[PDB]
Design a protein around this ligand. Structure first.
Ligand SMILES: [Ba+2]
Lengths: 175, 175
């Protein structure tokens, strides 16, 4: 069990967590301004994204705040407390994502025009706001700018394969 | 100054702070699910709000996270480190607010319906995302559910008057 004290400690860490609502998420601190993520459960399970532009700060020793906005218009504020194996995340979903989540279940990078046309056309308000604590079930050192971490759609057994060490090689690349 | 350790230490605290971008803001933890705010600087300078429903948690000892969504559509995620006199805020502004913050420059409570029509009528995207650290320049024990704290429109010398003890009497009521 490693102690996180600095931003450098945090960057390059790969996480799997589960919100109190039972929603399982995956997330990767690729470099100081970039994140990859993959959704395994809940309303938007199936969604995954690479090269997401984000603000990443250390609030105070070992506590990290990540802020971004998505192609669908979803806003995300995550607070990592890895020394306590926990997170707090607030997700602000546009109305249309709650109504039609199926649209957004894709590799969003390959469907940006669809997301943006959908977010303009459909309802934004009222937002669905999900502020929840989470338990971290996996933490691995991927190194930074590792393009293999999140590079395929989720499948049901994936998080288990990751946690059992059946997914990545000695280079932290896909088996 | 005082150590903040629990949610009760935090609730009822009245704050003034200045973000790294120079925007001065005022904020009040009215109760465990409600905030009051008043804006002194930057984009929406002059806006003030009472009775904004918010999610308030303590992340870990003395660190507090406040999440809410506004009548204009703005999404907010605030992090308080009152023991270090530091804040980090991320404000996700709808595009039309950055376009015409003046509509929004008002006592929002008397203008909910205007804000709702405005947010549907005008452009949401792209969002202006403002993630910034802030120095806390004032903290006062207001007590919970004190409606005097934020009960008038900002004026130029107000944060100075508050800091220099010329705004409240000993009961934390307006002078
Ligand atoms: Ba590292």
């Amino acid at each position: 069990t490693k102690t996180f004290k600095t931003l450098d400690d945090f960057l390059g860490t790969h996480f799997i967590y589960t919100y109190d609502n039972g929603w399982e998420y995956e997330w990767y601190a690729k470099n100081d301004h970039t994140v990859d993520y993959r959704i395994h459960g809940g309303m938007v399970a199936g969604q995954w994204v690479t090269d997401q532009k984000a603000d990443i700060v250390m609030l105070t020793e070992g506590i990290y705040k990540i802020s971004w906005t998505e192609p669908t218009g979803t806003d995300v504020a995550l607070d990592f407390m890895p020394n306590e194996k926990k997170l707090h995340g607030t997700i602000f979903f546009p109305k249309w994502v709650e109504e039609h989540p199926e649209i957004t279940v894709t590799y969003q990078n390959e469907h940006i025009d669809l997301m943006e046309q959908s977010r303009e056309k459909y309802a934004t308000y009222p937002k669905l706001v999900v502020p929840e604590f989470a338990n971290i079930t996996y933490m691995g050192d991927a190194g930074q700018n590792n393009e293999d971490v999140i590079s395929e759609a989720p499948y049901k057994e994936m998080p288990n394969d990751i946690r059992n060490g059946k997914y990545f090689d000695q280079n932290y690349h896909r088996l």
